Amino acid sequence: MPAYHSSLMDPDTKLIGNMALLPIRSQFKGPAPRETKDTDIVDEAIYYFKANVFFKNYEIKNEADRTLIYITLYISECLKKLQKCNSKSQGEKEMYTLGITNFPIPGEPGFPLNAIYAKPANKQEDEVMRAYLQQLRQETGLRLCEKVFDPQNDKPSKWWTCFVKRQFMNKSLSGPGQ
């Protein structure tokens, strides 16, 4: 039963909608503060990913689970692009252009979990979580791009691209409306 759940829900950390704005250790611009611990929510998602995709039931403990699950859904999407990439350089350039696309946000149609995320009501909610989710995407893609390419040849490695078919509880951040 117990899939992996987020460790880093500090009571100091602010919420938008139903997602926790955990600090990020990234050079990308964004509203969450700069993380300095070795572990990070994007690294929780990336560390758990291979195990986490096999579980088929997932019980939301808190807003951080609604945050970390979003990363894994996005990792299960970036793997689609970089498996086609001939080189790490191509993938890194590709991944930067992937994450900036306008993915749906909570309750905006085609978003896959309208039952479970409530839409931000106001501009200072909406714009800030867009500015948050964007920098999560930007960092998440780059951290895969550092480790999916085998350094001997920039082959996008068999062991990572094997997972492309295995969508996280059959949920796609692409969204089923397309």
Partner: protein, 414 residues
């Protein structure tokens, strides 16, 4: 006055009990009311509007009178549901007990008809339903199935599906299907009928030039290219129609279409390494002579490059593969290029491509050693750089001549 859906009421009703192909159904409606209104013009206040209601492409096309689901949609739902429900029957798919070939065969051949007799837009709408689950489940079944009879009908379905929409093609290309087809062909050369259809479907999906997973090259790359070259050079004892030679030419041309760069190209390594290719060489020129492109088998909108020109530009990109031609073929290749480059009217996008192919030939073959048709080439290049039209393609042609001429001033008449 007429109930304004009547045209969609009738079109379905005739198909339900005639089984007509949809275009023939439309024709049946058009002629029947047409001929009565010709016999009694006083029917026009009804018959004119009945005809006029039929005039729909996708705009209100198959408009629902109220909540109906047309027969083809019902059957597609039922078939894709049951095929999925079999695909995941993990007991039966590996430790068989029930007899199931017959029911599957009936469902597959029913599917194949609906994909070709019914309205294409309905058929599209069911394939693209939930991020192509109907398609991807059927693909995953093909990897898992191993009755040759059932495999053959699945291929026919994939072709009909592939015809519908480039969005379906790009899904099939990205899925596992190409890898299993190439593995099947290299291992099971005995089912000539499956082998021909396999090469056809494999060329169809690659025809759009979509980038594949790098994991595909592991099977699709240089080993598979050598296998195809052996077939086109030597044939197989079981082929009495010689379809495999032609299909393998088209398949090599399809796979090359999406490859970037030049030197590392997995097909070009095969041509370099293969022991005296020659039948492929002269078959390839017979395509260029007519100038057709066998890979453009579908009318889908974002037309990729002309596959033959693309392929030859790759072949001459390096001296190791430029050597494959016999001297008599090389001369005819130059003759055919110098003719098309001179015949093509200015602004045809192809004239850039023939210019580039000639540029490649001169740079990597010993052209200035043999100078065949060199005076005609000078005269035509002298003309093209002096052609006086202003559209971007005319400029692009004019620019390629300049860069080719400065590299090989003899082509300018020095």
């Amino acid at each position: 006055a007429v109930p304004r859906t009547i045209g969609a009421e009738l079109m379905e009703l005739v198909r339900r009990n005639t089984g007509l192909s949809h275009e023939l159904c439309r024709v049946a409606i058009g002629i029947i009311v047409g001929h009565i209104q010709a016999s009694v013009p006083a029917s026009s206040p009804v018959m004119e509007q009945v005809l006029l209601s039929l005039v729909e492409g996708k705009d209100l096309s198959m408009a629902l009178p109220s909540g109906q689901v047309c027969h083809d949609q019902q059957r597609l739902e039922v078939i894709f549901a049951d095929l999925a429900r079999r695909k995941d029957d993990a007991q039966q798919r590996s430790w068989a007990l029930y007899e199931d070939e017959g029911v599957i065969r009936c469902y597959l051949e029913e599917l194949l008809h609906i994909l070709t007799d019914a309205d294409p837009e309905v058929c599209k709408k069911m394939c693209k339903r939930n991020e192509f689950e109907s398609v991807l489940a059927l693909v995953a079944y093909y990897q898992m199935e191993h009755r040759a009879s059932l495999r053959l009908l699945l291929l026919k379905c994939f072709g009909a599906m592939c015809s519908l929409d480039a969005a379906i093609i790009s899904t099939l290309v990205s899925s596992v299907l190409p890898v299993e087809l190439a593995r099947d062909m290299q291992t099971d050369t005995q089912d000539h009928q499956k082998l021909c259809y396999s090469a056809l479907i494999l060329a169809m999906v690659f025809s759009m030039g979509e980038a594949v997973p790098y994991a595909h090259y592991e099977h699709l790359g240089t080993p598979f290219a050598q296998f195809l070259l052996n077939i086109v050079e030597d044939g197989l004892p079981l082929d009495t129609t010689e379809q495999l030679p032609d299909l393998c030419v088209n398949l090599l041309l399809a796979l090359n279409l999406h490859l970037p760069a030049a030197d590392q190209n997995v097909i070009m390594a095969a041509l370099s390494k293969h022991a005296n290719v020659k039948i492929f060489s002269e078959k390839l020129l017979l395509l260029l002579n007519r100038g057709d492109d066998p890979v453009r088998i579908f009318k889908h909108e974002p037309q990729p490059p002309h596959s033959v020109l693309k392929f030859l530009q790759d072949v001459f990109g390096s001296p190791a593969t430029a050597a494959i031609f016999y001297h008599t073929d090389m001369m005819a290749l130059i003759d055919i290029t110098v003719r098309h480059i001179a015949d093509l009217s200015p602004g045809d996008k192809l004239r850039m491509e023939y210019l580039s192919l000639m540029h490649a030939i001169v740079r990597t073959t010993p052209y200035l050693q043999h100078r065949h048709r060199l005076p005609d080439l000078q005269a035509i290049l002298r003309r093209i750089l002096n052609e006086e039209e202003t559209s971007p393609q005319c400029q692009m042609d004019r620019m390629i001549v300049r860069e080719m001429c400065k590299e090989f001033l003899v082509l300018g008449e020095a």
